Amino acid sequence: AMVSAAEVVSAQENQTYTYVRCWYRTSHSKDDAATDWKWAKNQDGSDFTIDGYWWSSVSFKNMFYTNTSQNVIRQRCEETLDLANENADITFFAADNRYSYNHTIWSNDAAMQPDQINKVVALGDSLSDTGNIFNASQWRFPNPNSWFLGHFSNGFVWTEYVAKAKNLPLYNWAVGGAAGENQYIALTGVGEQVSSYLTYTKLAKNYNPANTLFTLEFGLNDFMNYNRSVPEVKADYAEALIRLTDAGAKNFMLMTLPDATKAPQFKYSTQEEIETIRAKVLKMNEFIKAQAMYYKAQGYNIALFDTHALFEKLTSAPEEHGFVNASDPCLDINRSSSVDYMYTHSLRSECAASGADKFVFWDVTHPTTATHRYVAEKMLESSNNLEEF
Numbered sequence: 042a043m044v045s046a047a048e049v050v051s052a053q054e055n056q057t058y059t060y061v062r063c064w065y066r067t068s069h070s071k072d073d074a075a076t077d078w079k080w081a082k083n084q085d086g087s088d089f090t091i092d093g094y095w096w097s098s099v100s101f102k103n104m105f106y107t108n109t110s111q112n113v114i115r116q117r118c119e120e121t122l123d124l125a126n127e128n129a130d131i132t133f134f135a136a137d138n139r140y141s142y143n144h145t146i147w148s149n150d151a152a153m154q155p156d157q158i159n160k161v162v163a164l165g166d167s168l169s170d171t172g173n174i175f176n177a178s179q180w181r182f183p184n185p186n187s188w189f190l191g192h193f194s195n196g197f198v199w200t201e202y203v204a205k206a207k208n209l210p211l212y213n214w215a216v217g218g219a220a221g222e223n224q225y226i227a228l229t230g231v232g233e234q235v236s237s238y239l240t241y242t243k244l245a246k247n248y249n250p251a252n253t254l255f256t257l258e259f260g261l262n263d264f265m266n267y268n269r270s271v272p273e274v275k276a277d278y279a280e281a282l283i284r285l286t287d288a289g290a291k292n293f294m295l296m297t298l299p300d301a302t303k304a305p306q307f308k309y310s311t312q313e314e315i316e317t318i319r320a321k322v323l324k325m326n327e328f329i330k331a332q333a334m335y336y337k338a339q340g341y342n343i344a345l346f347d348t349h350a351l352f353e354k355l356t357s358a359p360e361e362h363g364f365v366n367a368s369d370p371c372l373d374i375n376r377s378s379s380v381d382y383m384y385t386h387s388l389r390s391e392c393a394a395s396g397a398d399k400f401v402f403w404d405v406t407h408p409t410t411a412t413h414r415y416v417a418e419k420m421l422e423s424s425n426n427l428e429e430f
């Protein structure tokens with residue numbers, strides 16, 4: 042059951058209030074990842090507060106549960122900041138004071154919800170993480186001057202673009218790792234993400250898992266550091282889907298893995314290492330397609346997007362997709378060291394000239410926010426903008 046019914050009522054009845062931290066990109070340019078924050082206000086100038094309750098598992102990572110909708114909170118942030126900036130890329134969190142870390146706000150659903158997708162729940166790695174490893178690392182990994190507030194990019198990741206296009210709240214369980222290295226590998230596992238999603242949603246009011254759109258992508262971390270073999274990663278992926286569908290999940294956005302060996306990171310790897318990872322990716326992608334077919338045959342709503350085929354096109358012919366460069370990071374990083382994520386980096390001259398929206402890669406591994414937007418747009422086109430869901 043994860044949390045007893047008694048524990049749930051006791052936590053839900055422990056009613057209180059908290060404040061809202063409104064984050065925003067300080068520059069009008071997506072070349073600058075730097076952010077700042079302001080407390081949300083009401084139109085009369087008074088502090089905006091939200092009512093609800095706190096809950097943390099043995100993780101001690103506190104989530105605030107409110108009846109106030111994500112749209113109302115976003116609206117308060119937008120009006121408070123009054124930034125005539127198209128690239129403000131506003132995000133928000135619960136915080137009692139300046140000492141507080143960035144707590145996720147869960148907006149409780151109404152008892153009478155229509156049978157329709159009303160939220161996005163993301164699971165995965167640094168292709169989806171919006172702040173979990175950042176929060177875990179105490180706002181250090183990745184550096185907030187060169188990576189957009191805990192996202193491994195210069196802005197929003199594909200899940201945020203998918204959720205925004207559909208005007209849906211996004212709740213993130215994805216956790217960034219370290220490409221080609223062993224840092225955080227016992228903490229980033231999809232098993233722990235599914236367990237966490239199953240524990241925290243038990244505290245939500247009127248939660249109907251049938252109304253959640255689940256996104257899932259992982260396996261590249263394990264293939265890059267040799268932590269889990271192809272069959273071990275296939276088993277982990279199959280387990281995540283078994284556990285989620287057994288817990289009432291009905292809707293999934295699945296994707297094949299892009300060939301990470303096409304990223305700037307692998308300029309510094311040996312050909313032997315590259316061919317090994319490429320082969321694991323190809324093997325995993327056939328399994329992902331088989332899993333999508335398996336759940337579709339059982340009557341689940343599955344949208345499978347071939348991200349692998351898209352990144353093959355993006356890296357071989359960037360000019361056909363609106364990019365000038367798919368071979369270098371936009372940031373002036375010329376090695377593959379996890380240590381670089383702790384520091385500030387200038388843009389390399391070619392990226393300063395063209396703008397970050399014309400580069401496929403932000404750093405040696407991760408796509409820029411323009412690439413994330415393109416992937417989101419291509420996925421939304423393949424799924425005919427909520428067709429099966």
Ligand SMILES: CCCCCCCCCCCC(=O)O
Nearest residue numbers: 166167217218219261262301
């Ligand atoms: C060709 C583009 C490839 C994009 C690779 C994205 C990085 C995958 C995530 C692996 C690191 C991690 O987050 O644990």
